[PDB]
Structure formats: structure tokens, C-alpha cells
């Protein structure tokens with residue numbers, strides 16, 4: 107895989123090529139690339155020009171790294187991400203997270219599109235990620251598998267406090283004081299590898315396990331971020347309701363997923379701006 | 390693993406070495422190879438003579454591809470299949486499915502032996518597969534992993550309609566007018582990788598997940614078939630009741646599995662006959 | 675698919691047999707913080723894993739990385755002082771390599787031990803849970819040490835695991851233990867393997883509870899599958915080293931230092947238990 111020097115080489119490339127010094131990294135998921143629009147003094151790198159960066163092969167993933175200020179805050183944004191289903195091993199999927207750490211980032215915001223498993227969710231809802239279920243992790247697909255480098259973190263990091271409690275309370279609070287539009291949802295995200303969508307029986311499995319939303323990303327990035335000590339916040343856009351009975355003739359499809367992101371673009375933009383305000387400055 | 394041209398080469402080899410032109414492909418699982426017996430005008434290929442075909446290493450898997458007519462319908466049958474527990478990557482396990490598509494097949498019938506998890510099933514029951522749970526797929530073992538080729542299908546295919554609803558309706562109706570003793574069962578098949586058989590605690594996990602029958606195949610072939618637009622029908626022969634308590638001195642074993650297929654041969658042969666009568670003809674000949 | 679040939683296992687076995695006069699009947703694999711179980715071996719002869727042909731290396735704290743032959747309560751034993759885990763980067767054929775070596779040495783009984791997180795709310799830190807059964811989550815998805823061509827010199831293509839943990843040993847150990855006036859009962863339950871190396875989320879803890887697991891760890895199962903495949907009698911137990919976090923209010927977190935400390939606290943109870951255990955292992959039919 108990647109040596110420590112590989113991560114350092116990439117971080118040094120970025121640090122040499124930009125004056126931006128980000129505090130927060132944001133990973134934009136399927137159809138959420140629009141979150142880069144409000145960056146000021148934006149500087150763009152195509153992933154292809156960044157040493158060791160994988161390529162985004164999925165539609166709705168632009169494949170660019172954008173530095174700028176978001177609500178005055180120094181950010182770096184992955185406009186597009188990587189997925190196991192593309193053929194990438196998790197050490198590639200998660201590579202940018204350790205680079206961000208080496209750039210000086212102290213907070214990772216992870217975003218995604220997700221299928222709703224909890225019947226109370228509607229398409230267009232934002233679900234705050236309170237926790238996850240790492241199904242690939244259980245079987246061996248964990249980005250920390252292999253020799254541990256103490257320069258990044260511990261051999262056996264805990265994940266029970268992965269999603270930052272303070273930011274979650276603040277976000278929930280702020281959306282109470284609105285009382286406008288749908289309320290902010292909260293729940294458990296389960297990662298499945300994909301790329302095919304779930305059967306009805308699989309939908310019922312994931313529900314029985316206690317997941318509220320399902321997708322094919324995010325969890326590995328969180329694990330790596332927590333290993334290197336980043337504060338983590340996550341949310342899903344619920345882009346479709348997972349099919350849960352044999353009567354329906356509806357089927358999950360990627361077109362509908364991207365369409366739901368386009369529709370929620372302004373709402374997501376607002377949410378992320380309020381989010382930045384809840385991140386404390388470094389010491 | 391395989392290039393688009395690899396699939397092409399194999400399909401052209403077959404198209405150039407037989408005049409048979411199948412509409413239906415049938416994959417015969419453990420102890421089910423006898424389903425080939427009623428083929429008329431049979432032409433046999435050993436897998437070893439077919440470019441790019443993997444080899445069947447499991448007992449009760451003959452490793453032959455047979456072309457012929459089954460109750461008057463033009464079929465190609467896998468007498469034996471491949472399993473990930475043999476060492477094969479899923480792109481090898483499922484290779485033939487994409488070949489079948491290129492041969493002009495529009496329907497895939499997948500068969501297997503399976504261990505009964507639903508206590509209402511008896512050894513010798515046929516269970517129609519209404520749905521599946523893909524446990525390896527959750528963790529990354531899906532035959533679609535990697536770059537997608539649009540010449541086969543979509544990057545993100547849906548699976549919630551994988552097992553053709555109309556065929557299942559017709560098979561159930563037709564079978565319940567034939568007044569046979571044991572009813573035709575219907576349920577959810579769960580794939581596990583194996584090759585070791587389940588513990589009691591594992592059996593209870595699978596039951597809790599909602600599975601009726603468990604085996605170690607089939608699901609990857611269905612995913613690949615649905616990706617390329619094939620109509621899919623599946624059934625399991627329940628060959629053993631999975632062990633469910635710590636008192637029992639009985640154990641799952643492969644010999645009992647094959648024996649159950651032997652005993653069920655006449656019931657299978659008849660089922661497969663009314664199955665063929667439930668497969669739509671193509672719009673144009 | 676397995677990276678080792680039959681001859682690789684043979685070579686390692688012959689090397690050991692030609693470098694010690696010890697001829698073990700019982701192999702014992704010592705888990706995290708349980709390496710002290712070797713302290714009571716008499717006539718102990720130690721090999722570093724690094725000097726044994728084909729042996730993997732233990733890279734985890736609390737795993738010494740030594741193979742120790744000797745007598746335990748009068749019985750000929752070989753003990754792995756430290757083991758290997760999938761999370762270290764090893765394929766399962768490497769993790770489980772020693773088990774087939776033990777079979778070639780003449781061992782007929784494998785005792786597997788580990789530290790484990792408690793999922794059953796009745797367990798307390800320091801409890802010994804006898805393993806009645808396991809749930810092999812990596813196995814379901816393809817990570818099984820038997821994957822690939824099968825060598826009938828070791829065992830069957832499709833071995834059963836429903837009787838993996840020897841009932842008779844478990845009945846004898848429980849009975850003997852009960853008659854010795856110990857205040858805290860031996861526990862008994864199902865161990866679930868997850869790959870790690872990160873510890874469980876609360877949601878994951880709840881999944882594992884709902885699946886019927888009593889304790890969770892990151893080892894053991896592969897070794898048992900290989901042991902049963904080649905016909906070894908198997909006994910297993912876990913030291914419950916921590917209660918897995920199961921609510922969002924707690925500020926406590928699983929951590930490896932506390933895991934190792936729990937093994938230190940339990941050294942004496944574990945020593946005494948492994949003695950009752952050795953007395954519960956049948957002798958071979960012939961000497």
C-alpha cells in the first residue's frame with residue numbers, strides 16, 4: 107500500500123502549491139458537489155494532478171479538490187469521493203483523510219446520499235449521522251488492517267464516540283429554533299459495499315439491525331479520521347426510500363439519487379454554512 | 390479480470406461449434422446434474438475445452454455444458470457450477486452468465502441444493518426463490534465490483550425485482566393444480582461463502598435475518614444475469630435441515646446432500662418441465 | 675489459494691520434532707494478556723517464532739511471540755505464547771498455520787483462549803466464559819481459512835462446525851469447577867468474531883447482541899475451523915476484559931491497555947482454571 111512518505115509527499119505537494127491552510131475538510135457525496143459553490147477565494151486541483159490521488163469514476167463526483175473559505179472558515183473540499191465498488195482498496199478510498207491530517211486539518215465533515223430505511227424519513231430529508239454500522243469492517247474490510255503507524259494513531263482506536271456530540275446538539279438546536287420546513291432527522295448509517303442496490307429481504311435485514319439509512323461510502327473515511335484524531339461530523343441526504351415490499355414496481359436508481367441532490371442543493375448549502383459556525387477554532 | 394473480448398471469444402467458440410441456439414440457460418447445482426438427462430439432441434462440451442471456462446472441482450459437479458431441447462424449448466445447461474469457496478474470484482464464478490447473454494439466451498434458471506432454515510421445510514421440498522440475502526456482497530464480494538461496462542449493463546443495477554414475479558405466479562398456480570403431496574415452498578435464500586457448514590448460533594443468525602434456506606452459490610450469478618437484463622428464475626432443493634440445537638448428534642454432510650438430489654430426481658424432472666412451460670417466448674422468432 | 679503446501683507444514687513439524695524431545699498431546703493458544711499461562715509449564719523449552727520455519731510473527735502488545743513445550747499439570751503441552759490476527763495483515767492461512775503443524779506433531783486437542791468484550795449484560799470483567807459456540811462473521815463473506823483447494827490429508831471439503839466445541843470437556847470442566855466452592859460461576863456462551871482492529875460502535879454492539887453473541891473478539895474462530903477440519907478436539911474460553919459500550923451517554927471507551935490489565939488481574943483464576951481443564955482432557959487410546 108502507501109508508505110508514510112507517500113502521504114507526506116502528497117501533503118507537501120499541496121502545501122507547496124497553495125497558500126490555503128485548511129482547518130476543516132469536507133467530503134461531498136453523490137450529487138452534493140454543489141457544496142463547493144459558496145467557497146470564496148477558491149483554488150481548484152483536479153485529482154489527476156495530485157500525486158497518489160485516486161480518480162472519481164462515478165457520475166455526480168467531479169474529481170476535484172477545492173480550497174477556499176466557507177462562511178469565512180478555511181476549508182478543503184473533496185468534490186467527489188471514492189468507493190470500494192469502483193475497485194479501490196480501502197487504503198485508497200481513505201488516502202485523502204490522512205493527507206488532510208498532514209495539511210493541518212482538525213475536523214472532517216463527511217456527506218453522502220443514502221437510501222432511507224426508517225419509514226419516517228422522506229426524500230429530501232437530511233439525516234444527521236449519530237452512529238454507523240460497518241458491515242464490511244466486520245468481515246475484514248477495515249482501512250486500518252495491516253501494520254499500524256503510531257505517527258497516525260493507535261493500534262486499537264475506539265469508535266463509540268466517532269460522531270462529535272457537541273456539533274450534533276448545536277445542529278439539532280439550531281433547526282428547532284427554525285421550526286420551518288421538515289425537521290432535522292438523526293440516525294444510524296449502515297455501509298454496504300454495493301454497487302447493486304438492495305433486495306427487499308436485504309432492506310429488512312438492515313432495518314432489523316437498527317440502521318436508519320444505507321449507503322456505500324463514508325464509514326471508512328470516519329474510521330481513518332478518528333484514528334488520526336480528527337473531530338468528525340456526518341450527514342446523509344435521503345435521496346430515495348429503499349424498496350420494502352414485493353408489490354412495488356418502483357426500483358432504486360442513480361438518476362433519482364442525483365435528481366434529489368439537485369433539488370436539495372440550496373437547503374444543503376444553508377445547512378453546511380450553519381455547520382461551519384459550530385466548529386470551534388483550533389487552540 | 391476478463392475483457393469484453395474474452396466473453397466474445399468464448400461465445401463465438403460455442404456459436405461456431407454447435408448449431409444449437411438456446412433461449413434458456415439452466416445452472417445445475419449439487420446433486421442436480423441429472424436435470425440434463427431429459428435433453429433431446431444433446432451436444433456436450435467439457436468445460437476444459439471451452440476457452441476461459443473455469444473448472445468444477447466439487448463432488449456432484451460434472452463440469453459439462455450441454456446444449457439441447459428440454460420439453461421442446463432450446464436450452465443450454467451447466468452440469469456443475471463454480472463456488473467462491475473453491476478459490477475462484479466472483480468474476481470467474483459468474484463468467485458463463487455473460488457468455489449466455491451473448492449466445493442469445495434471455496432467461497437464466499438457477500438451481501441449487503440448500504440447507505433448510507425454515508422448520509416447515511422437509512428434505513426433498515423444492516423452494517422457489519422469491520428473494521435473496523447477499524451476505525458476501527455486503528462486505529465487498531459482489532461480481533460487479535470494479536469498472537462497469539455499459540455493453541453489459543448499468544453501474545448501479547436494482548435487485549429488488551431479481552426473481553421474475555410472473556414465472557413464480559405461474560409455477561405456483563400450475564403446481565397447486567397438480568395436487569402433489571408436499572406443497573411447493575417459496576422463500577428467501579441466503580448466501581454464505583462456506584465451505585464449512587453452519588454452527589447452531591449461525592443457523593439462528595440466518596433465521597433471525599429472515600432467510601428460509603442457506604447455501605454457498607447462486608446469488609452472484611443472479612446479480613450478473615440481472616445486470617445484463619436476463620429474466621431470472623431460481624429454486625432450491627432442500628437437502629438437509631440445518632442443525633438447530635446443541636443436543637443433536639446429527640451433522641450437515643455433503644454425502645447426505647447428494648443423496649437427497651438422487652431421491653428427488655423424478656420430482657425435479659417434473660418440476661423443471663412445467664417451469665419450461667412458464668417461460669415466455671421471445672417476441673419474434 | 676492457501677499459500678502453504680503440505681510440505682511447508684511438514685517441514686515446520688519435522689524441524690520442531692528434531693529440535694525438542696517434547697512430544698505434546700495438547701496445544702494451547704494464549705490470547706491477549708494471557709501469556710502468563712505458560713508460567714506453570716515444567717521442563718519448558720522455548721522457541722521464538724522468528725526461529726521456526728514458516729511461522730508468522732506476533733506484532734501485538736501482550737503477545738510474546740514464543741512457542742513453549744513443557745508439562746502442564748503433568749500433561750505434555752505446547753503453548754503459543756501469543757497468536758496472530760487478521761487485522762495485523764495476515765491472511766487466514768497464515769493466522770492458522772500453527773494449527774496444522776500441531777496436528778503433524780501428534781497433538782489431538784486444541785485449547786483456544788482469548789480476551790473478549792462482554793456483550794451479555796450479566797458478564798462482569800474478570801469472568802471466564804466457556805465458549806459453547808461461535809458466530810463467524812468474516813466466514814460468511816468469504817474469509818474462511820479453508821477457502822481454496824482442499825487437501826484430504828488434512829480433512830474434508832465440507833466440514834461441519836455444529837459440534838466444534840467438545841461437549842464432554844465442557845460438561846466435565848463445569849462439574850469439577852462447581853465442586854471447588856468458587857464464588858463466581860463459570861460463564862458459558864457464544865463468541866462472535868469481528869475482524870477489527872477498531873472497537874465497536876454502540877450500534878454495532880447492538881447488532882452483535884441481537885445476533886445472540888455473548889462476547890466479541892478478533893481471533894480464535896479461524897483456528898477452531900482449521901482444528902476441526904483436521905480432527906482435533908477443541909475447547910475454548912474467553913476472559914471477559916471489558917463490557918462493550920452500549921449507550922450514547924457513557925464516556926467510557928474500550929481500550930487495549932485496560933484489556934491487558936484485566937488479564938493481569940485474572941492470572942491466578944486463569945491458572946487454576948486451566949488446571950481443572952487439563953484434568954478434563956482424554957488421553958489418547960494408545961500410548
Ligand SMILES: Nc1nc2c(CN3C[C@H](CO)[C@@H](O)C3)c[nH]c2c(=O)[nH]1
Nearest residue numbers: 136219220221320321322358360363
Ligand atoms: N446501498 C445504497 N446506497 C444508496 C445511495 C448512496 N450512493 C448513491 C450512488 C448510487 O446512486 C452510490 O455511490 C450509493 C443512495 N441510495 C442508496 C440506496 O438505496 N442503497
Ligand SMILES: Nc1nc2c(CN3C[C@H](CO)[C@@H](O)C3)c[nH]c2c(=O)[nH]1
Nearest residue numbers: 419502503504603604605641643646
Ligand atoms: N451453507 C450451506 N450450504 C448448503 C448446501 C448447498 N451446497 C451443497 C454443497 C456441500 O454439500 C456446497 O456447495 C453447499 C446444502 N446444504 C447446505 C447447508 O446446510 N449449508
Ligand SMILES: Nc1nc2c(CN3C[C@H](CO)[C@@H](O)C3)c[nH]c2c(=O)[nH]1
Nearest residue numbers: 706789790791890891892928930933
Ligand atoms: N472486538 C473486540 N475485541 C475485544 C477484545 C479481544 N482482543 C483484545 C485486543 C485489543 O485489545 C484485540 O486483539 C481484540 C477484548 N475486548 C474487545 C472488544 O471490546 N471488542
